[PDB]
Scaffold this active site. Structure first.
Site, PDB file in Angstrom:
ATOM      1  N   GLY A   1       0.792  -1.219   0.000  1.00  0.00           N
ATOM      2  CA  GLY A   1       0.000   0.000   0.000  1.00  0.00           C
ATOM      3  C   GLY A   1       0.826   1.271   0.000  1.00  0.00           C
ATOM      4  O   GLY A   1       0.528   2.211  -0.748  1.00  0.00           O
TER       5      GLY A   1
ATOM      6  N   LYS B   1      -0.988 -17.899  -6.547  1.00  0.00           N
ATOM      7  CA  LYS B   1       0.467 -17.956  -6.536  1.00  0.00           C
ATOM      8  C   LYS B   1       1.040 -17.973  -5.116  1.00  0.00           C
ATOM      9  O   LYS B   1       2.124 -18.521  -4.893  1.00  0.00           O
ATOM     10  CB  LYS B   1       1.064 -16.790  -7.353  1.00  0.00           C
ATOM     11  CG  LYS B   1       0.703 -15.396  -6.873  1.00  0.00           C
ATOM     12  CD  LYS B   1       1.759 -14.830  -5.985  1.00  0.00           C
ATOM     13  CE  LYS B   1       1.300 -13.529  -5.353  1.00  0.00           C
ATOM     14  NZ  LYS B   1       2.339 -12.943  -4.452  1.00  0.00           N
TER      15      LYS B   1
HETATM   16  N1  LIG Z   1       3.873  -6.549   0.187  1.00  0.00           N
HETATM   17  C1  LIG Z   1       3.968  -6.903  -1.127  1.00  0.00           C
HETATM   18  O1  LIG Z   1       5.096  -7.167  -1.574  1.00  0.00           O
HETATM   19  C2  LIG Z   1       2.942  -7.055  -2.247  1.00  0.00           C
HETATM   20  C3  LIG Z   1       2.989  -7.025  -3.816  1.00  0.00           C
HETATM   21  C4  LIG Z   1       1.673  -7.225  -4.575  1.00  0.00           C
HETATM   22  C5  LIG Z   1       0.402  -7.432  -3.817  1.00  0.00           C
HETATM   23  N2  LIG Z   1       0.463  -7.436  -2.330  1.00  0.00           N
HETATM   24  C6  LIG Z   1      -0.828  -7.624  -1.667  1.00  0.00           C
HETATM   25  O2  LIG Z   1      -1.263  -6.370  -1.235  1.00  0.00           O
HETATM   26  C7  LIG Z   1      -2.377  -6.520  -0.317  1.00  0.00           C
HETATM   27  C8  LIG Z   1      -2.077  -5.423   0.709  1.00  0.00           C
HETATM   28  O3  LIG Z   1      -0.982  -5.872   1.523  1.00  0.00           O
HETATM   29  P1  LIG Z   1       0.260  -5.039   2.084  1.00  0.00           P
HETATM   30  O4  LIG Z   1       1.485  -5.720   1.646  1.00  0.00           O
HETATM   31  O5  LIG Z   1       0.170  -3.570   1.617  1.00  0.00           O
HETATM   32  O6  LIG Z   1       0.318  -5.054   3.925  1.00  0.00           O
HETATM   33  P2  LIG Z   1       1.041  -5.724   5.043  1.00  0.00           P
HETATM   34  O7  LIG Z   1       0.507  -6.952   4.472  1.00  0.00           O
HETATM   35  O8  LIG Z   1       2.186  -4.989   4.552  1.00  0.00           O
HETATM   36  O9  LIG Z   1       0.415  -5.031   6.358  1.00  0.00           O
HETATM   37  C9  LIG Z   1      -0.635  -5.298   7.223  1.00  0.00           C
HETATM   38  C10 LIG Z   1      -1.378  -4.021   7.076  1.00  0.00           C
HETATM   39  O10 LIG Z   1      -2.737  -4.243   7.473  1.00  0.00           O
HETATM   40  C11 LIG Z   1      -3.125  -3.287   8.355  1.00  0.00           C
HETATM   41  N3  LIG Z   1      -3.719  -3.901   9.521  1.00  0.00           N
HETATM   42  C12 LIG Z   1      -3.170  -4.693  10.518  1.00  0.00           C
HETATM   43  N4  LIG Z   1      -4.109  -4.990  11.386  1.00  0.00           N
HETATM   44  C13 LIG Z   1      -5.303  -4.388  10.958  1.00  0.00           C
HETATM   45  C14 LIG Z   1      -6.678  -4.309  11.434  1.00  0.00           C
HETATM   46  N5  LIG Z   1      -7.028  -4.917  12.556  1.00  0.00           N
HETATM   47  N6  LIG Z   1      -7.645  -3.579  10.688  1.00  0.00           N
HETATM   48  C15 LIG Z   1      -7.322  -2.927   9.514  1.00  0.00           C
HETATM   49  N7  LIG Z   1      -6.027  -3.004   9.088  1.00  0.00           N
HETATM   50  C16 LIG Z   1      -5.036  -3.715   9.783  1.00  0.00           C
HETATM   51  C17 LIG Z   1      -2.048  -2.291   8.699  1.00  0.00           C
HETATM   52  O11 LIG Z   1      -2.571  -0.999   8.444  1.00  0.00           O
HETATM   53  C18 LIG Z   1      -0.837  -2.750   7.855  1.00  0.00           C
HETATM   54  O12 LIG Z   1      -0.486  -1.691   6.956  1.00  0.00           O
HETATM   55  C19 LIG Z   1      -2.272  -7.942   0.171  1.00  0.00           C
HETATM   56  O13 LIG Z   1      -3.346  -8.661  -0.293  1.00  0.00           O
HETATM   57  C20 LIG Z   1      -0.987  -8.546  -0.448  1.00  0.00           C
HETATM   58  O14 LIG Z   1      -0.958  -9.898  -0.720  1.00  0.00           O
HETATM   59  C21 LIG Z   1       1.743  -7.246  -1.545  1.00  0.00           C
END
Ligand SMILES: NC(=O)c1ccc[n+]([C@@H]2O[C@H](COP(=O)([O-])OP(=O)(O)OC[C@H]3O[C@@H](n4cnc5c(N)ncnc54)[C@H](O)[C@@H]3O)[C@@H](O)[C@H]2O)c1
EC number: 1.1.1.8
Length: 350
Positions: A16, A205
């Site tokens: 994000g 994946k």
């Molecule tokens: N990190 C990566 O490399 C990458 C690349 C492509 C897609 N994604 C996908 O992106 C999506 C977003 O994931 P991400 O990587 O940004 O986060 P994280 O997976 O990095 O972080 C957990 C996040 O969730 C939140 N959180 C924790 N507890 C919470 C609660 N009780 N209520 C609401 N929010 C809470 C926090 O704000 C924190 O930012 C996921 O589905 C993931 O698979 C990740």
């Protein structure tokens, strides 16, 4: 000649925050997008300070995206309704476990012609079969939906290392508009129309990557990891074709959302890291997530659990060996060392 569209980024984690660098910079550069980019941040207490204040002050979400600043125009906003009120484009990017609630609260508070794009990797199950997260989001909030999926390890994206992604969108106009908002000279986008297949790739994946981590955890190398990726892809296509509505074409898996994300994830993803440690320490996945990911979330195992549920409601569990092998090692207590057996016996075609 159109007004500038307001963008709201729902989520602020690892991916994000990285997406906010990209969007913040493009909105600031392109007239079509309003420079004020809001980002919903689930408030947290970081040493007395509110995370939302840290971000808006130091312009960096170092807890989730270390060594990177966020464009000053991205505003941190703790109340999701407020963050989304005037948005025209809503990027949904938060771990699977949290969208339902977010949707509970946004329902009915979105602008009339708002649209959304989901970056979430995972699947739900519906009263009857597979139910895509973008579909869930789209139906509760009543807005048209797209998906952005590709081989995008966040830290690398944040570092501007060259990479690509796939945007699934049915509407050509919208497809091009979303691409202008996300594309970077180092974040190359291809837009395709089968939203469903593209989304499902991102979801599956991560299960395969847990398996790759196990093999690393058992001491294997590249030949093995390639096998795991190959067999996983064989299961992905077969699985997409069975449970996805509308036509599923193999060609779509040759897009970034498919073969590429499957590769990058199995080599440097969080699911692979935690999976390997599971293989080595015997600790619980939950514990490993807390001890190793400093707050970030895993999706691979929870997704496998979802697959198990979808497959069993159709008595087809015996049909996806590799997927189910990941599920049994994570949840049933099957010795990890038995993972290789599901590769050695894997059907040659599906
Ligand atoms: N990190 C990566 O490399 C990458 C690349 C492509 C897609 N994604 C996908 O992106 C999506 C977003 O994931 P991400 O990587 O940004 O986060 P994280 O997976 O990095 O972080 C957990 C996040 O969730 C939140 N959180 C924790 N507890 C919470 C609660 N009780 N209520 C609401 N929010 C809470 C926090 O704000 C924190 O930012 C996921 O589905 C993931 O698979 C990740």
């Amino acid at each position: 000649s159109m007004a500038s569209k307001k963008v709201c980024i729902v989520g602020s984690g690892n991916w994000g925050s990285a997406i906010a660098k990209i969007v913040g910079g493009n909105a600031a550069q392109l007239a079509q997008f309003d420079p004020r980019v809001t980002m919903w941040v689930f408030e947290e207490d970081i040493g007395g300070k509110k995370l939302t204040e840290i971000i808006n002050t130091q312009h960096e979400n170092v807890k989730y995206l270390p060594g990177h600043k966020l464009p000053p125009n991205v505003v941190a906003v703790p109340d999701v309704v407020q963050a989304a009120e005037d948005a025209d484009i809503l990027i949904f990017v938060v771990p699977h476990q949290f969208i339902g609630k977010i949707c509970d609260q946004l329902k009915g508070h979105l602008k009339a012609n708002a649209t959304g794009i989901s970056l979430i990797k995972g699947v739900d199950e519906g009263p009857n079969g597979l139910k895509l997260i973008s579909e869930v989001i789209g139906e509760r909030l009543g807005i048209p939906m797209s998906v952005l999926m590709g081989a995008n390890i966040a830290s690398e994206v944040a570092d501007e290392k060259f990479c690509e992604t796939t945007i699934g969108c049915k509407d050509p106009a919208q497809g091009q508009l979303l691409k202008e908002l996300m594309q970077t000279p180092n974040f190359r986008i291809t837009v395709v129309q089968e939203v469903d297949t593209v989304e499902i790739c991102g979801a599956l994946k991560n299960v395969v990557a847990v398996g790759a981590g196990f093999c690393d955890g058992l001491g294997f190398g590249d030949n093995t990891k390639a096998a795991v990726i190959r067999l996983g892809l064989m299961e992905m296509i077969a699985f997409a074709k069975l449970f996805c509505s509308g036509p599923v074409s193999s060609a779509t898996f040759l897009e970034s959302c498919g073969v590429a994300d499957l590769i990058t994830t199995c080599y440097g993803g969080r699911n692979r890291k935690v999976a390997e440690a599971f293989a080595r320490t015997g600790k619980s996945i939950e514990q490993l997530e807390k001890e190793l990911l400093n707050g970030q979330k895993l999706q691979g195992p929870e997704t496998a659990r979802e697959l198990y549920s979808i497959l069993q409601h159709k008595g087809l569990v015996d049909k996806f060996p590799l997927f189910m092998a990941v599920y049994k090692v994570c949840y049933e207590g099957q010795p990890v060392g038995e993972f290789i057996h599901c590769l050695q016996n894997h059907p040659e075609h599906m």
